[PDB]
């Protein structure tokens, strides 16, 4: 283990000593764009370093090639680097062409110091042993997993390091096998970066309501994919909310009151900024629970809305303008007629932020708006770079959306979220009508060849959102076994497909013995092994390893080779 939770403050003080020189800017923050949790963590760190007046550089990175190019362009004066949301699984010193000897200064005296110290922060569990153990430049902020579950891995790695007859070779083989079985494991995430930096801040003691709100947003960002982690971390955020809230409850609403509350936050889509009927119609959970893509789904939706006794016009009215009667009896109405249709899990308790008279807002709606701003905020290797430029630019739009003075941007993000949900819903219903998903014994392939708004899915987050829709829909199909799906989208301008390796997940609210065991996305090593051989001009640069760009001509041979591959 490198940096435990209890010793994060030591790293903070070391960084402060290294680069609290206002004459220059010797600290640079690298953040993976198209990642909400990384954005929230970077906002926390930016506010914190604004407090101590430490000049910092914030660079949003989309692909690994961009990271290496920037590091090559990176000046030598910068003695402190921060990686947010990436770098914890790959050989950075090999990736960035780094040896300890070039960066080491004042080597003497059992100690070592370096002219450039890089601190990574991501929660992907395949912690690179050469990066967590066999280096001093790379500094990782462990969340208690390496120090507790990688003891055998630590011993094997140190045995290999110290050893560079027959029984000696046998033990070397055993240690290497242990290391390898530790590897070849799907990339999974156990904690949220926002919670880790919030714990660090609490250790420093510079917390406030805004930082707690940022931590709530960052944790909520992982609810859709990693709901078990969200349930694990929910009590800590709840206790922090109870602690920080002033005792002057039920106070008269002033234009300056900023209140965080814990209240029923039902698992709908943009409830407070859309009609109840549309919230149900666009909720991924409800859609998966009744398979609304069929014509029977809309009829059954009307069936519920009739069964509760709510007029359809009232349900289709905007949330703010509904009658106060329904707006004050929604909870009881859900209590009466939710278990009937199996949608009892919709009822949930979450955190709601109210800023004076500006109206309330829930964390789920805010993170949906942020993701929408990330996605659609605005010969072959040139237009792709322009797409990277636009994707990175949308990161700053999503970042500035955090400011309470830019609520107009938040409204645009909400509209974009509604439109993106509509587009993903329509694409899913069209796919499930035409049955573009071809079931195999390895993975359920699905490639979009032509159709509407296909240019929207070249954005990685849009493809992930479509994957969330389809995986949620297929999760409620008990007949359909657990199996990953693969999505591709041809970019006509570049004549390339965007293959997105996905992973199955357990249905939300379905908690079992196997549910506690996470699903591991083994598309990483399969993709890399297939690409290393049989050169097909594949572009694997995303920090999310299960996303590649493939030539249109090479798409079919690549998929055939992947079927021949049993790695995943």
């Amino acid at each position: 283990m490198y940096y435990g939770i209890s010793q994060f403050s030591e790293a903070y003080n070391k960084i402060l000593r290294n680069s609290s020189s206002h004459s220059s800017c010797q600290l640079v923050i690298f953040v993976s764009c198209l990642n909400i949790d990384a954005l929230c963590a970077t906002k926390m760190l930016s506010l914190l370093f604004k407090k101590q007046l430490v000049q910092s550089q914030i660079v949003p990175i989309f692909g690994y090639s961009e990271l290496r190019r920037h590091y090559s362009q990176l000046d030598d004066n910068i003695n402190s680097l921060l990686l947010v949301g990436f770098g914890g699984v790959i050989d950075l010193e090999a990736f960035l062409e780094i040896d300890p000897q070039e960066y080491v200064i004042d080597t003497d005296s059992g100690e070592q110091s370096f002219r450039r110290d890089i601190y990574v922060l991501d929660a992907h569990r395949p912690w690179n042993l050469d990066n967590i153990f066999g280096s001093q430049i790379i500094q990782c902020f462990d969340d208690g997993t390496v120090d507790d579950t990688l003891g055998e891995q630590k011993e094997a790695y140190y045995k290999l390091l110290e050893l560079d007859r027959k029984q000696r070779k046998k033990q070397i083989h055993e240690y290497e096998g242990v290391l390898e079985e530790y590897y070849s494991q799907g990339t999974t995430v156990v904690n949220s970066i926002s919670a880790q930096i919030y714990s660090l801040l609490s250790a420093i003691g510079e917390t406030n309501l805004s930082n707690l709100w940022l931590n709530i947003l960052g944790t909520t960002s992982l609810d859709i994919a990693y709901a078990q982690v969200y349930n694990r971390l929910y009590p800590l955020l709840q206790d922090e909310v109870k602690r920080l809230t002033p005792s002057s409850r039920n106070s008269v609403k002033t234009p300056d009151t900023l209140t965080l509350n814990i209240q029923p936050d039902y698992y709908l889509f943009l409830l407070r900024h859309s009609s109840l009927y549309d919230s149900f119609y666009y909720s991924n959970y409800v859609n998966a629970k009744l398979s609304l893509w069929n014509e029977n789904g809309k009829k059954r939706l009307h069936k519920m809305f009739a069964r509760m006794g709510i007029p359809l016009s009232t349900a289709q009215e905007t949330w703010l303008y509904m009658d106060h009667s329904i707006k004050r009896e929604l909870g009881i109405i859900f209590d009466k007629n939710l278990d009937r249709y199996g949608l009892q899990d919709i009822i949930r308790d979450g955190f709601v932020r109210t800023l004076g008279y500006r109206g309330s807002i829930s964390a789920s709606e805010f993170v949906e708006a942020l993701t929408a701003l990330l996605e659609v905020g605005n010969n072959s290797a040139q237009k792709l770079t322009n797409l990277r430029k636009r994707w990175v630019s949308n990161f700053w739009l999503s970042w500035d959306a955090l400011d309470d003075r830019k609520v107009e941007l938040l409204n645009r993000g909400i509209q974009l979220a509604q439109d993106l949900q509509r587009a993903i819903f329509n694409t899913g219903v069209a796919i499930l009508e035409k049955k573009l998903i071809k079931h195999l014994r390895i993975y359920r392939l699905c490639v979009l060849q032509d159709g509407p708004d296909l240019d929207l899915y070249r954005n990685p987050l849009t493809l992930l959102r479509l994957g969330n829709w389809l995986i949620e829909c297929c999760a409620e199909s008990e007949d359909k076994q657990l199996l990953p799906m693969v999505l591709a989208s041809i970019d006509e301008n570049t004549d390339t497909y965007l293959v997105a390796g996905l992973t199955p997940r357990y249905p939300r609210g379905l908690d079992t013995i196997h549910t506690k065991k996470p699903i591991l996305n083994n598309f990483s090593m399969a993709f890399q092994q297939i690409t290393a051989e049989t050169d097909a001009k594949v572009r694997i640069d995303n920090f999310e390893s299960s996303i590649i760009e493939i030539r249109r001509e090479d798409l079919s041979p690549f998929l055939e080779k992947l079927t021949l591959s049993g790695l995943l």
């Binding site: 609490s202 003691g205 510079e206 206790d239 109870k242 002033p246 005792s247 002057s248």
Partner: protein
């Protein structure tokens, strides 16, 4: 056998739970400590005033601590019943520790004090267990039941009260290697609130439930002068606390009078004073406006109040029946008394404690100059009454001889030629003094 027999836990400048999960434990000069329920247990927050040397921290607690004490190098927490104590140094280099107090039947921890040499715990029974920084015990003692404690860098102060003996103070300097004692069980003049506790109070029943004897805080001064404050709303100072024979309990402030005379004439009650520390006329105190005496978490700015002996007479201050008008005649004498007492206190620490900030000698000289300025004003006031003997008596206490020349000029100017010769005689005597 009830009420005051409940030696309920008390901390310097405490606070009741009131109507919330929240509660302030201690409000020292170096910060404050607060508690809150996370719907099942207390999470304790410690914040400091000297932002730049210490850092706020809030920590999980399942025991539900009930007492606190803060210092420059570490803070101590304690429990009322089964009173496990926990001492945590602010710096991470020194490891925090916890231990269990030896608790007996009817025993309840009253107050705890921590000193960079030893840590001492108060007891409802009256025990005086003495420990070290790290928890290893040193000695256990028993005296009259301690109910409050205070610790300077190396000196500590205690008040022993029992239903048999009354309020007796004891001030002793533990020291690095010299356990020098300065007082032991000597009585003290603080008035205890009993009439107001006879079921006639508005929302003060809850506070009296928190603190039966209504003692607010026992902070020291910037130079080590013990100070007392309670429901009587009057500070008490130990002028010559250095000499055991020279005990002097002097009233230095009267909160009700100051509040009334700064309120414009209204005898308002909703203004309550929570003192934190006194430092050379700088008495920091929250002036809460409302029915709740104890402060809140949007903590009111610690507005500073100056010292004023209760020489202000309501009959005299009612000259203008209703910016409250101040009659200058005794106000100047009040300033004279302030300068005299502050000169005594500063001189006490000048030879013993030495210089603290590099300006003590200059402020002492300025204070003496103001002392003789007030003396000259009173001399002129006496000459206004054509009381040559009164002016003669006032002239003896002048310190600066420039003020003596001014006294000569006043005598020759305030229609008192007979005073001129005697002031000149005093000046000639001073020439040889």
């Amino acid at each position: 056998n009830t009420g005051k027999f409940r030696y309920m836990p008390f901390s310097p400048a405490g606070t009741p739970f009131g109507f919330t999960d929240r509660r302030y434990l201690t409000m020292n000069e170096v910060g404050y400590v607060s508690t809150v329920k996370n719907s099942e247990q207390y999470s304790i927050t410690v914040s400091f005033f000297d932002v730049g040397r210490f850092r706020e921290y809030h920590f999980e607690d399942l025991f539900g601590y009930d007492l606190c004490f803060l210092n420059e190098k570490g803070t101590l927490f304690g429990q009322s019943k089964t009173g496990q104590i926990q001492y945590r140094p602010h710096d991470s280099i020194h490891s925090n520790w916890t231990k269990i107090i030896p608790l007996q039947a009817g025993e309840r921890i009253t107050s705890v004090a921590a000193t960079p040499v030893r840590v001492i715990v108060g007891t409802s029974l009256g025990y005086f267990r003495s420990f070290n920084q790290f928890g290893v015990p040193f000695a256990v003692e028993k005296t009259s039941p301690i109910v409050a404690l205070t610790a300077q860098n190396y000196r500590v102060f205690s008040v022993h009260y029992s239903q048999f003996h009354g309020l007796s103070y004891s001030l002793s300097e533990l020291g690095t290697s010299s356990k020098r004692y300065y007082k032991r069980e000597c009585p003290l003049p603080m008035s205890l609130p009993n009439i107001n506790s006879d079921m006639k109070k508005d929302a003060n029943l809850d506070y009296y439930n928190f603190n039966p004897m209504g003692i607010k805080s026992l902070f020291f001064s910037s130079y080590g002068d013990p100070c007392i404050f309670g429901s009587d709303n009057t500070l008490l100072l130990l002028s010559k606390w250095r000499s055991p024979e020279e005990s002097k309990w002097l009233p230095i402030l009267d909160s009700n009078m100051e509040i009334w005379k700064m309120s414009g004439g209204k005898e308002t009650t909703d203004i309550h004073v929570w003192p934190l520390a006194l430092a050379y006329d700088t008495l920091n105190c929250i002036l809460v406006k409302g029915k709740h005496i104890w402060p809140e978490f949007p903590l009111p700015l610690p507005s500073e109040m100056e010292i004023r002996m209760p020489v202000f007479v309501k009959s005299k201050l009612l000259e203008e029946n209703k910016e409250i008008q101040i009659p200058v005649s005794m106000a100047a004498e009040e300033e004279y008394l302030r300068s005299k007492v502050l000169s005594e206190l500063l001189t006490d620490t000048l030879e013993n404690d030495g210089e603290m900030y590099g300006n003590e000698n200059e402020v002492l000289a300025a204070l003496n100059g103001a002392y003789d300025k007030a003396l000259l004003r009173l001399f002129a006031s006496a000459c206004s009454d054509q009381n040559v003997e009164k002016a003669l008596s006032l002239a003896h206490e002048l310190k600066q001889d420039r003020a003596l020349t001014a006294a000569v000029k006043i005598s020759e100017r305030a229609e008192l030629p007979s005073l001129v010769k005697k002031i000149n005689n005093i000046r000639e005597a001073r020439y040889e003094q």
